[PDB]
Amino acid sequence: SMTDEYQLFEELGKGAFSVVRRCMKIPTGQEYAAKIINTKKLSARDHQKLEREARICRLLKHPNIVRLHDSISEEGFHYLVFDLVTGGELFEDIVAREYYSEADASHCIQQILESVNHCHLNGIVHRDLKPENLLLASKSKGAAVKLADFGLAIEVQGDQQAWFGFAGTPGYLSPEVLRKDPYGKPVDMWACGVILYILLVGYPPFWDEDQHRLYQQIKAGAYDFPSPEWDTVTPEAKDLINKMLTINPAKRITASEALKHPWICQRSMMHRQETVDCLKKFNARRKLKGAILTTMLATRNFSA
Amino acid sequence: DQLTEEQIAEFKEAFSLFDKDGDGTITTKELGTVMRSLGQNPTEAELQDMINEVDADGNGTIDFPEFLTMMARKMKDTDSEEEIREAFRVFDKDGNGYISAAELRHVMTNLGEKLTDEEVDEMIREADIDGDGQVNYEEFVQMMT
Ligand SMILES: CN(C)S(=O)(=O)c1ccc2c(c1)/C(=C/c1cc3c([nH]1)CCCC3)C(=O)N2
Ligand SMILES: [Ca+2]
Ligand SMILES: [Ca+2]
Ligand SMILES: [Ca+2]
Ligand SMILES: [Ca+2]
């Protein structure tokens, strides 16, 4: 059973009908995060969602996706054993730093795009891309960003699209979801555009306290790059954002295409040389006369 | 202006020997370094007076135009004879009447110059008319006139 395989330690966090505790695989000593779900509290509907989420997480193995290592069902408790991460949410790192440099933003979004591309290649649409759902694997300046919170993820068949429901996070919702149109993989690329915008300047492209107005702005694509903060941001960054925040989902950049954008992947002169025929001749006579003249001048005080 | 281009070049060479840091001016300390390097022993007041006498614009240092105009002084012929003779005695450290390659090398080292032994020999040969390997008084005079 779970307690024969895993030693549980302190609580790290809480969730809906759940706690996360640090744990350790008994025979190996390797540490993880165990999400402990009290299934006596779950309706059949919610357990069905847990079933889908675990199935989807099991399928996904990638350095930029939080890995599910084990799913153990017991009486009244379900255990999901994930990677331990110590770097917190990308959201909080953005708040702490205000915003990222272009170098750091490009590097961050590159990893996010790899996570999204992997999902999409596997017939999974996450539907809830946002900095709160992206975790930093450790406290290293070089830590990997890892996609988490697959509670809204869906399984799709190729590029077939449908009305999969109104689900996601308001500021990150795509125009097609807001219009109640059929949708698919491109909703994650819209959300990516919102995150890139936030990375670069520390505030979102669409925001209003009145959610109806927020939704109107999103559907209109009513964002811009205002001065002065955007003045020093390169046009290449703004261009990639533009291609993600494209209202028509058929024209919106895909994750694979975005990974080839010059701002992401092209971040890192010869002149003729003339022949030297010889060196310049030492001028012996000028050297000697200069020295003699110097000495003549130097001897004036002794004479006068 | 009434000097030849080669005469100007010779004085620029002399100027570079005083202007140790190459900033285009000669300070009092620079003047003293040269003087003492050539076995001359002026007081600090004497050095400052030398600077003051040559410093036309009164900014405290000597630039190349000031340095030129000074030795554009067509002084007495007896004064130029004296300068040449005393200069000879500076090079001829052992007082035997001949400037050897070793003696010239020592003067150039004292002045802070870094020349090869071949360059020094070449310099001796420019003055050494009779080809004995040394510069005598008559040869030294001929060179400077
Ligand atoms: C993504 N959700 C927050 S979760 O509950 O499914 C989840 C999934 C994987 C996880 C953690 C949390 C998780 C939580 C966590 C919180 C804290 C830590 N890990 C490290 C020490 C301070 C607080 C962790 O390390 N790996
Ligand atoms: Ca100087
Ligand atoms: Ca001056
Ligand atoms: Ca001698
Ligand atoms: Ca001779």
Residue numbers in the entry:
A (entry chain A): -1 to 0, 11 to 276, 281 to 316
B (entry chain D): 3 to 147
Give sentences copied directly from the paper behind this entry.
Calcium/Calmodulin (Ca2+/CaM)-dependent serine/threonine kinases (CaMKs) constitute a family of 81 proteins in the human proteome that play a central role in cellular signaling by transmitting Ca2+ signals. Kinases in this protein family are activated through binding of Ca2+/CaM to regulatory regions that either flank the catalytic domain or are located in regulatory molecules. CaMKII proteins form large oligomeric structures. The N-terminal kinase domain is tethered via an autoinhibitory helix and a calmodulin binding site to a C-terminal oligomerization domain that organizes the enzyme into ring-shaped oligomers.
We were interested in exploring the structural consequences of Ca2+/CaM binding on CaMKII and determined the structure of the CaMKIIδ/Ca2+/CaM complex. The structure of the complex comprised the catalytic and the regulatory domain of CaMKII (residues 1–333) and full length human calmodulin, and was refined at 1.9 Å resolution to an R/Rfree of 16.1 and 19.9%, respectively. In the complex, the regulatory region no longer interacted with its corresponding catalytic domain. Instead, the conformation of the inhibitory region adopted an extended conformation, in sharp contrast to its helical secondary structure in autoinhibited CaMKII. The observed extended conformation allowed interaction between the inhibitory region and the substrate binding site of an adjacent catalytic domain. Most notably, T287 was aligned in a position suitable for phosphoryl transfer. Thus, the structure effectively “captures” CaMKIIδ in the process of transphosphorylation by a neighboring kinase molecule. In the complex, helix αD blocked the access to the binding site for the inhibitory helix by a significant reorientation of this helix with respect to the autoinhibited kinase; E106 and Y107, for instance, are displaced by more than 10 Å from their position (Cα) in the autoinhibited kinase and block the binding groove for the inhibitory helix. The movement of αD has another important consequence which results in structural changes within the kinase active site: E97, which is oriented away from the ATP binding site in autoinhibited CaMKIIs, was positioned in a conformation that enables coordination of the ATP co-factor in the CaMKIIδ/Ca2+/CaM complex. Residues in the interface were well-defined and the recognition motif bound tightly within the central cavity of the Ca2+/CaM structure while no stable contacts were made with the kinase domain.
